[PDB]
Design an enzyme around this catalytic site. Sequence first.
Site, PDB file in Angstrom:
ATOM      1  N   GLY A 211       0.704  -1.454  -0.198  1.00  0.00           N
ATOM      2  CA  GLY A 211       0.153   0.066   0.117  1.00  0.00           C
ATOM      3  C   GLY A 211       1.372   1.771   0.095  1.00  0.00           C
ATOM      4  N   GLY A 212      -4.215   0.719   1.245  1.00  0.00           N
ATOM      5  CA  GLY A 212      -4.924  -0.904   1.569  1.00  0.00           C
ATOM      6  C   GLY A 212      -4.647  -1.064   3.170  1.00  0.00           C
ATOM      7  N   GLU A 313      12.073   7.384  11.829  1.00  0.00           N
ATOM      8  CA  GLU A 313      10.188   7.515  12.293  1.00  0.00           C
ATOM      9  C   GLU A 313      10.488   6.579  13.799  1.00  0.00           C
ATOM     10  OE1 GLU A 313       9.350  10.174  11.011  1.00  0.00           O
ATOM     11  OE2 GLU A 313       9.430   9.510   8.617  1.00  0.00           O
ATOM     12  N   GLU A 326      10.041   3.531  10.987  1.00  0.00           N
ATOM     13  CA  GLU A 326      10.250   3.045   9.667  1.00  0.00           C
ATOM     14  C   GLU A 326      11.506   4.174   8.952  1.00  0.00           C
ATOM     15  OE1 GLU A 326       7.144   4.258   6.346  1.00  0.00           O
ATOM     16  OE2 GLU A 326       7.890   6.265   6.782  1.00  0.00           O
ATOM     17  N   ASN A 328      13.023   6.774   6.546  1.00  0.00           N
ATOM     18  CA  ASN A 328      12.599   7.019   5.745  1.00  0.00           C
ATOM     19  C   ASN A 328      13.728   7.822   5.448  1.00  0.00           C
ATOM     20  OD1 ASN A 328      11.253   9.040   3.803  1.00  0.00           O
ATOM     21  ND2 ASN A 328      10.273  10.595   5.312  1.00  0.00           N
ATOM     22  N   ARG A 330      15.125   9.933   2.799  1.00  0.00           N
ATOM     23  CA  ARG A 330      15.261  10.948   2.102  1.00  0.00           C
ATOM     24  C   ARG A 330      15.508  11.896   3.183  1.00  0.00           C
ATOM     25  NH1 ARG A 330      11.281  13.031   2.547  1.00  0.00           N
ATOM     26  NH2 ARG A 330       9.267  12.389   3.191  1.00  0.00           N
TER      27      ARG A 330
END
Length: 465
Positions: A211, A212, A313, A326, A328, A330
């Site tokens: 992804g 839902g 995160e 997660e 991230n 970037r």
Amino acid sequence: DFTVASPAEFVTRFGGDRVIEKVLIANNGIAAVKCMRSIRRWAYEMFRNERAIRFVVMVTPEDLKANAEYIKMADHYVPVPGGPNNNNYANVELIVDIAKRIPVQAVWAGWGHASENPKLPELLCKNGVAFLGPPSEAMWDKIASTVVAQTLQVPTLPWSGSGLTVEWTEDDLRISVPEDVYDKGCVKDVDEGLEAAERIGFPLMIKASEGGIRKAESAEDFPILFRQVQSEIPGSPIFLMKLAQHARHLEVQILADQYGNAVSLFGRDCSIQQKIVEEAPATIAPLAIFEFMEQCAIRLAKTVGYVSAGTVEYLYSQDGSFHFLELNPRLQVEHPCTEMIADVNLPAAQLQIAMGVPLHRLKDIRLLYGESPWGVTPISFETPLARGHVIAARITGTVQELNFRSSKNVWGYFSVQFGHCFSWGENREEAISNMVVALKELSIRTTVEYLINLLETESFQNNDI
């Protein structure tokens, strides 16, 4: 007080392996403007020539029509098809073609568009072009990464894969999640779904990894909602994860080089939730806890072979627990908060890292750690104080800088409208007060009244969760 004549001289003397003197920016708007302003500033300081690093930008018909600032700012531009970003900024094959044909030595994608697509660094690398970002192998979903986090003793929310770990003491001779462990994190049937959900507890999310997503309140609501997820993205692995309570989004900012070194740059707290207000450093968490979070974030980055700037995160709750969400992969639009409190120019650090320069040879990093600005000796990033405090407030490819005459430590932009104001103070109190003063100047409306009310309530001034 250490300058050099050219990028080639810089790479040699600072220990890099790749001369980058022309960059393609696969983005527009504030990302493109900030990338250029930041690297030219560094270029002026290192080479006494603000244009020593050249920029080519990609420009849509829409951006040209609006005469977007970043177009004339760039040393060169290349028109690209308009429409949705799969035709332009998020089109990997086009970015790569432009990059080979100019040619440039590196691409920066900043945030949005293709910035999270592994295929971009992979194709760039295939073609001899650097990416100011993590390599494809690093960047290579929530199930695997959560398993990797648990393997490295980083805390995660209870989920259908809780307790899974992988073979790891394979050392710095990249980690990998076996297909067979991956599956135990997935729920195939409503039936094994409901069993997993009774271990996990309610409420929980049912999530298609491709992804839902549904939120489930009980074992009775669960089957309907699970069937809905399966109907919405057929074939996808589904996982369950528990909702968090009395919790706050926080991040650790990380910077890693191409040699397995990584450092944290403090982090950020979203103190009003999309993010309305973001703060650096994250003062909601006791320092001892946040430094443990930093050390977890760093270990994760090294283990997946991360390179460049990135965010880990987390959720943090009142009871002190935190959980990995997660990595991230970037730079984010709120990065000026971090740059301010850490005195680090992040786009320029990304560029230096892409040229093969190690972390301990990044001057901002040496100074952050209280070392000589131009020394060459390695630094223990395991064995710094935040420079004041920043509040960033969301206000709501053309870019207009915000104009403060009476308010002092405040800056910002908006673009086509949404933007941010960023307010610095010696402590959180002064940062908040400076922000309120600036918003009142801005108001000569709706966004300003909304924000000022927010910032003036006791709950915010106390920083309650």
